[PDB]
Amino acid sequence: CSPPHQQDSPVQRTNEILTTSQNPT
Amino acid sequence: MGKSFALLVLGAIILAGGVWYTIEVGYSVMAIVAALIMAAGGGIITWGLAVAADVNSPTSHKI
Amino acid sequence: VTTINAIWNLGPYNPSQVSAGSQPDVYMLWTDGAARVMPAWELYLGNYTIPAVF
Amino acid sequence: PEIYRGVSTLDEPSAAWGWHGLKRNTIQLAGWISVLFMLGYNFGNHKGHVETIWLLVITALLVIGLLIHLFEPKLSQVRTITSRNKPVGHVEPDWTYDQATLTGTWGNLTDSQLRSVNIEPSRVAHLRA
Amino acid sequence: ADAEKVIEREGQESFHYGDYYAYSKICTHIGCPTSLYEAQTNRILCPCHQSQFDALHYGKPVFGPAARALPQLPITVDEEGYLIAAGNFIEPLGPAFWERKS
Amino acid sequence: CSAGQITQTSSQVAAVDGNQAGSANDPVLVRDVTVHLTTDGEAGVKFTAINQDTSHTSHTLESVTVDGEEVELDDAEPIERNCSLVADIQSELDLIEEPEVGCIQHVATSLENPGFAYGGVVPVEFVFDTGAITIDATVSAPVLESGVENREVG
Amino acid sequence: CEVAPPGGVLGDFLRMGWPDGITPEAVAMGNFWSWVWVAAWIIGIIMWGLFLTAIFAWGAKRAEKRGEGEFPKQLQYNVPLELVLTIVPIIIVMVLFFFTVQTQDKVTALDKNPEVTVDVTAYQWNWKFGYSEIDGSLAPGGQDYQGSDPERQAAAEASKKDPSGDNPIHGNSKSDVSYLEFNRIETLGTTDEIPVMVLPVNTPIEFNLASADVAHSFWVPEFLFKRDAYAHPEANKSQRVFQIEEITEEGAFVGRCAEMCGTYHAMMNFELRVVDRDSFAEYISFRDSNPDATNAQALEHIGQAPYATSTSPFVSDRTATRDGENTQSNA
Ligand code: HEC
Ligand SMILES: CC(C)=CCC/C(C)=C/C=C/C(C)=C/C=C/C(C)=C/C=C/C=C(C)/C=C/C=C(C)/C=C/C=C(\C)CCC=C(C)C
Ligand code: FES
C-alpha cells in the first residue's frame, strides 16, 4: 500500500560545493 | 464491620504503590499517573470508610 | 440582483494555474467531497496500478 | 394492542401503517461495518496522532455501545425501604378529603384539637358518635 | 537551515543545484496544480482536495488523497549562468493511470 | 490544538538568506550570516556577531574565512556583553546609519571571489579569542533598492 | 498593630504561612492578621462544636431510647435571644472595622518623605526599573540626584499628538506614552536575565508604577503588599505612587506579578535586592559614572551576586521543560 520504488536513500547528503568558471581577466 | 476491612486493605497497598512510584520517577508525565494511582488508593480508602459508616448507622433498614 | 459566476475576473484557462476556492457547482459538491474524504488507498500490482480515486 | 410485522402497537403506535422495526441483527451488522471502516481510516498517509486519539476514542465508544446493544443487560428493581416510605402493598389515604370531612386520618380528634383547628365540637359531636 | 534536513529519494541524489529544488507542479492525485508552497512548514499544498507533500522529504505526501511523491526535475546552470534542465523526469508525472508502474 | 507546546508560529526563523548559529545558552551568536556577491562581481560576508556571555568576557573577532579563504575586515572593536558587531560589504553598509545610542558598531568587509556560485552553500569559519564557530552560508546577491528596477526584456 | 502576636508555635500556627515581613507596616499587617485569625478560630471552633453536638447529642435514636417520643418541643421563636445573637456580630464587625481603618490608614498614607524614588514600568512580559530621584545623602553629587532623561522623555512628551494626525482619544494619539518616565539609570529585565532593583536599608522609599501594555501588578511578598500598575494611571483615577517607611533588613527577595496580563504571566518575575546603605552610594556612583556598564557589573562592584539568586530565568523552550528542569543556569 505504498509504491515499491519510493524508497529513502542511504546517502546522507554531505555538502557538494559548487563553482562557476571565472573570466581570465 | 463487613467488607470495609478488605476494601481498606486493598486500598492501603495501592496507595503505597502510588506514592512509592511518585518518589521514584522524577518530574515527568508519569508523575501525573503516579498521582492518579495514589488518589485512586485514597478513594478506595474512603470508599471502605463510607461502607463502614453505612454499616455502623444504617438508614435504609430493610434490604 | 445577485451576481453568479463572474467569469470576467477568473481569466482564461491554462493548466498551470489554480485558486484556493475552486470547487465545482453546488450540485457537484457532493462528488467533490467524496474525493476529499477518501483516505488515499492505492494499489500497485507489478506493471499496473489502481489509483486511489477508483 | 396487536403486533404488526414484529413490533407491538404499544411501542410503535402506527405499527400497522408502515415500516417500523429494524431487526437488531441489522443494527449490529451496520455498527460493526462502521467500526471496521473507522479503524481502516488510520492506515492513510497522515503523520500526526491527534487524529488517532479521536478515532480510537470514538471506536471504543462505538464498541461499548454495540456490546451493550448486543447483550442488553438489565438490573432488578430494588426492594429496600429507605425511610418512612412504605412497601408496595400500601394504600395511600386521601389526606385532603379526610381534612375536609373529619373522617379517616382526621377522625376522632379530641375536643382540644378540634378547637385548635377553629372547629367548634358542638357541630361535630354526632359525627364522632 | 532547511536544506540541511532534506531527505533524498533513492536515485534522485544529484537533481538539486544547491538551495534550488524543482518538483513537478502537477498533483499526483488528480492533477490540479499544487502551487501552495508554505514557506515555513515547507509543505507543498494542493487546493483541490487538500493533499500535502513534504518538500523536504522528497515531496512525499503527508496528508490528503495523494499516495505518491511528486516527481523531481534535475537542474543545473549553463555556460552563461542561466538555469537549465539537466535531464528528463525519470518518473511519469501527472495522475496515475492503469498501466503506470507504481 | 495549534496553541500546544509544538506550535507553528514558534518554530519560525526570519525570512532572510542568512543562516544562524547559537542557542540562547551559547556565549556568542552569529545571526544572518551570508556570502554576498553583487552583480558587479565584488563580494563579502554579511553577518552580525552578538555577545551575550554572562561571564562578561568581552571578545574580539580575530578572523573570518569562507571555505578557508580569507575575508578582509578591519577596525573591529571588542564586543562586550549585549553588543552587536554588524558586518557587511561597504556599499551595503553605507545604506544604514550607525546608532549613536546603543552598543552597535558597523564594520566593512570584502573578499576576493574564488568562483563561488549563486545558489550554492559554502562553509564560513569565524574565530574569536575565545573560540571558533562554524556555519554554512548561502551565496546570493544583495537586495535592490526597492521600487527602482523594472523587468527589462533586452 | 502595636501589639505583637502570641508568638511561639501558636504564632507560627496563627501566622499561618505569611512571611515575617521586612518593613514596619509589614509588621503591622502581620500582627493584625494574627489577632484576626485568633478571633476567627474562636468563632470556628465555637460553631463546629454546635454542629458536632447535633451529630452526637441531638440524635433521634438517643432521644427515642430515652423515651422522649416522636417529636421535640416544637419551639419556633425566641425573640430576645435572636436580638442578642443579631447584636453580637454587629459589634464584632464594628470593633474589627475600627482596627482595620487604623492599620489601613497607616499603610496607605503618602507622607513618608522618600529619600529614594524609583519609577517602575510594567510591560508584556518583564519589568524595567529606573531611579527617579535620590536624596543628597546617597546621591553621587552631594546634591539631590534627578534621573529623568531629557531627550528620551522629550520623545515621550512628543508622542502625545500629531503622527500626521489621528488624535482619537480625547485629542491625544491612541499610542500615547507620555505617562511613562524614562530615566538615564535603568535596569531592563529580559528573558535571559531576571532584573534586580538595588535599594538601601533604613531609608523611606517610594515606588511610582505604570504599565506600557495591559494592567499588571507589583507584588513583593516580603512587603505583604501589592499594587496594580495601569496604563494612564491618571486617566484611570488610580493612585500610582506608594511609599514604604523603610526596609529593615538586607537581603534578596523575589517579587511577582499578581495580575493576569497574558500568555507569559508566570514568567514575569523580578528581584528586590536590599543592600547596606554605604554600598548603595557606591552602586549609584558606579552606574552614573560609566553608564555603559550592565547591572550585573555594578552588583559585582558591590561584591555580591551579579544575578538574581532568589529566582532564575525560566527556560524559553516549549519542549525542553517537560522533565521539570525549567531553570536556566545564569552562570
Ligand atoms: C512576543 C511577545 C512578541 C512581541 C512583543 C513582538 N513580536 Fe515580533 N514576532 C513574534 C513572533 C512569535 C514572531 C514570529 C511569527 C510571525 O508572525 O512572523 C514575530 C515576528 C516578527 C517579525 C517578522 C520577521 C521576518 O523575518 O519577517 C518582525 C519584523 C517582528 N516580529 C517585529 C517586531 C517588533 C518591531 C516588535 C515590537 C515593536 C514586535 N515584533 C513585537 C513575537 C513578538
Ligand atoms: C445525483 C442525484 C440523483 C442525487 C444526489 C446525489 C446522490 C446520488 C446522493 C445519494 C445519497 C444516498 C442514497 C445516501 C445514502 C446513505 C446511507 C443509506 C447511509 C447509511 C449509513 C449508515 C451508517 C454509517 C450506519 C452507522 C451505524 C452505527 C454507527 C451504529 C451504531 C450503533 C450503536 C453503537 C448501538 C448503541 C447506540 C448508540 C450509542 C446511539
Ligand atoms: S488534485 Fe491534488 S489533492 Fe486532488
Kindly tell me the burial class for residue E72, based on how many C-beta atoms sit within 10 Å of its own C-beta (0-12, 13-18, 19 or more): buried
Residue D15's identity, in one-letter code, is: A
Domain co-membership, G162 together with G47: no
CA distance D107 to D120: 15
Domain co-membership, G139 together with G102: no
Alpha helices in chain C (DSSP H): 29-37
Ligand 3 atom closest to residue E95's alpha carbon, by position in its atom list: 1
Is residue F122 less than 8 Å (CB to CB) from chain A?
yes
CA distance F136 to F21: 9
3-class secondary structure per residue, G107-168: HHCCCCCCCEEEEEEEECCEEEEEEEEECCCCCCCCCCEECECHHHHHHHHHCCCCCCCCCC
E102 Cα to chain F: minimum distance (Å) = 33
- Among C44, C47, C48, the strongest candidate for a mutation testing the A interface, having the largest count of A CBs within 10 A, is C44
Give the range of the structural domain holding residue B24, as residue numbers without chain letter.
Answer: 1-63
Q: Report the sign of the C-alpha dihedral through residues D82, D84, D85, D90, in that order.
A: positive
User: Are residues C20 and E96, on separate chains, in Cβ contact within 8 Å?
Assistant: no
Q: Is the CB of E70 under 6 A from ligand 3?
A: no
Give the range of the structural domain holding residue G34, as residue numbers without chain letter.
Answer: 8-108
Domain co-membership, G156 together with G239: yes
3-class secondary structure per residue, D60-122: HHHHHHHHHHHHCCCCCCCCCECCCCCCCCCCCCCHHHHHHHCCHHHCCCCHHHHHHCCCCHH
CA distance G9 to G12: 5
CA distance G242 to G123: 19
- Among F42, F121, F124, F140, the strongest candidate for a mutation testing the A interface, having the largest count of A CBs within 10 A, is F121
User: Are residues E41 and F8, on separate chains, in Cβ contact within 8 Å?
Assistant: yes
CA distance G87 to G81: 10
Domain co-membership, G126 together with G90: no
Residue by residue, DSSP assigns E24-35 as -SB-SSS--B--
Question: Is F46 within 8 Å of F37 (Cβ atoms)?
Answer: no
Torsion of CA G84, G87, G88, G90, to 10 degrees: 170
D45 Cα to chain E: minimum distance (Å) = 5
Domain co-membership, G288 together with G166: yes
Q: Which residues of E are catalytic?
A: 29, 49
Q: Which residues of G146-164 are buried (b: 16+ CB within 10 A; e: fewer)?
A: ebebeeebeebeebeeeee
Total number of domains in chain B: 1
Domain co-membership, G193 together with G73: no
Domain co-membership, G154 together with G252: yes
Residue E5's identity, in one-letter code, is: K
What the block records as the C-alpha cell of F69 is 579563504
From the list A1, A3, A4, which residue is nearest C41 (CB)? A1
Q: F14 CA distance to ligand 1 centroid (A)?
A: 10
Query: Which residue shows C-alpha cell 435572636?
Result: G82
User: Are residues G318 and F24, on separate chains, in Cβ contact within 8 Å?
Assistant: no
Domain co-membership, G127 together with G13: no
Q: Report the 10 Å Cβ neighbour count for G58.
A: 11
G2 within domain boundaries: no
Domain co-membership, G146 together with G277: yes
CA distance C15 to G1: 85
Q: Report the 10 Å Cβ neighbour count for F92.
A: 16
Give the residues after which the backbone of chain C is interrupted, taking a C-to-next-N distance over 2.5 angstroms as a break. none
User: Are residues G294 and F81, on separate chains, in Cβ contact within 8 Å?
Assistant: yes
SS3 content of chain B, % helix, strand, coil (to 5): 80, 0, 20
Structural domain ending residue among the three candidates G61, G87, G108: G108
G268 is in an annotated binding site: yes
Residue by residue, DSSP assigns chain E as --STT--PBTT-TT--BTTB--B-SB-SSS--B--EE-TTT-EEE-TTT--EEETTTTTEEEESS--SPPPB--EEE-SSS-EEE-S--SS--SS--TT---
Give the residues after which the backbone of chain A is interrupted, taking a C-to-next-N distance over 2.5 angstroms as a break. none
- Among G190, G294, G316, the strongest candidate for a mutation testing the F interface, having the largest count of F CBs within 10 A, is G294
Domain co-membership, G205 together with G144: yes
Q: Report the 10 Å Cβ neighbour count for D47.
A: 11
Chains A and C touch (3+ CB pairs under 8 A): yes
Question: Would you say how long chain B is, in residues?
Answer: 63
G198 within domain boundaries: yes
G126 within domain boundaries: yes
Question: Is F30 within 8 Å of F135 (Cβ atoms)?
Answer: yes
Question: Is E97 within 8 Å of E91 (Cβ atoms)?
Answer: no
CATH code, domain with G259? 2.60.40.420
CA distance E19 to E24: 17
What the block records as the C-alpha cell of C11 is 481569466
Which chain D residues have any C-beta within 8 angstroms of a chain E C-beta? 45-47
Distance of CA D50 to the CA centre of its chain: 38
CA distance F85 to F58: 12
Method: cryo-EM
- Non-local (6+) Cβ contacts of G99 within 8 A are G1, G32
Q: G105 CA distance to ligand 1 centroid (A)?
A: 45
Which of E30, E43, E45 is the best mutation target for the ligand 3 pocket, counting ligand atoms within 8 Å of the beta carbon and taking the most? E30
CA distance B38 to E8: 50
User: Are residues B63 and D82, on separate chains, in Cβ contact within 8 Å?
Assistant: no
User: Are residues E102 and A5, on separate chains, in Cβ contact within 8 Å?
Assistant: yes
- Non-local (6+) Cβ contacts of E19 within 8 A are E3, F119, F120, F121, F138
Resolution in A: 3.1
Q: Is the CB of F13 under 6 A from ligand 1?
A: no
CA distance B14 to B16: 5
Domain co-membership, G194 together with G282: yes
Quote the radius of gyration of chain B (alpha carbons, Å): 15
Q: Is the CB of E86 under 6 A from ligand 3?
A: no
Interior angle at CA G241, CA G236 and CA G245, nearest 5: 155
Domain co-membership, G94 together with G122: no
Q: Report the sign of the C-alpha dihedral through residues D49, D51, D52, D57, in that order.
A: positive
Q: E28 CA distance to ligand 3 centroid (A)?
A: 7
Total number of domains in chain G: 2
**Nearest ligand to the C-alpha of residue D33?**
2
Residue D69's identity, in one-letter code, is: H
Q: Which among D19, D24, D11 has a CA at the least distance from the CA of D2? A: D11
- Non-local (6+) Cβ contacts of G187 within 8 A are G128, G129, G130, G195, G196, G197, G295
Query: Which residue shows C-alpha cell 536599608?
Result: G201
CA distances from E67 to A2, E10, E53, G286, G295 (A): 7, 17, 10, 68, 59
Residue G99, SS3? helix
Task: Specify the pairing of strand G145-146 against strand G126-134.
Answer: antiparallel
**Nearest ligand to the C-alpha of residue E70?**
3
